[PDB]
Amino acid sequence: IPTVIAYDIYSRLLKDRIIMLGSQIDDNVANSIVSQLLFLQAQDSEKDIYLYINSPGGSVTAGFAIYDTIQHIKPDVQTICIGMAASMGSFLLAAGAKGKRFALPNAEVMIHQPLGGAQGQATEIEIAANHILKTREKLNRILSERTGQSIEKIQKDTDRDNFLTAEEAKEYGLIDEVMVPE
Query: Which parts of this chain interact with ligand USU (CB under 6 A)?
Result: 12-13, 16, 18, 34, 38-39, 42, 50, 52, 69, 72, 80, 82
10 and 20 in contact (C-beta within 8 Å)? yes
Which residues, 148 to 167, sit near a copy of itself by CB under 8 A?
A: 159-161, 163
Nearer to ligand USU by C-beta: 27 or 137?
27
| Cβ at position 131, least distance to ligand USU in Å | 24
Nearer to a copy of itself by C-beta: 135 or 144?
135
Which residues, 38 to 97, sit near a copy of itself by CB under 8 A?
A: 38-39, 42, 52, 54-56, 61-62, 64-65, 67-69, 71-72, 74, 82-84
Active site residue 112: yes
Q: Report the amino acid identity of residue 134.
A: K
80 and 103 in contact (C-beta within 8 Å)? yes
Mapped onto helix, strand or coil, the DSSP state of residue 73 is coil
177 binds, among ligand USU, a copy of itself, none (CB under 5 to 8 A by kind): none
CB burial string 139-162: b at 16+ within 10 A, e below: bbebbbebbebeeeebbebbeeeb
Beta-bridge partner residues of 163: 110
Which region, judged by CB under 8 A, interacts with a copy of itself, from 101-109, 146-154, 169-177? Answer: 101-109
d(CA 54, CA 20): 8
Known catalytic residues are 87, 112
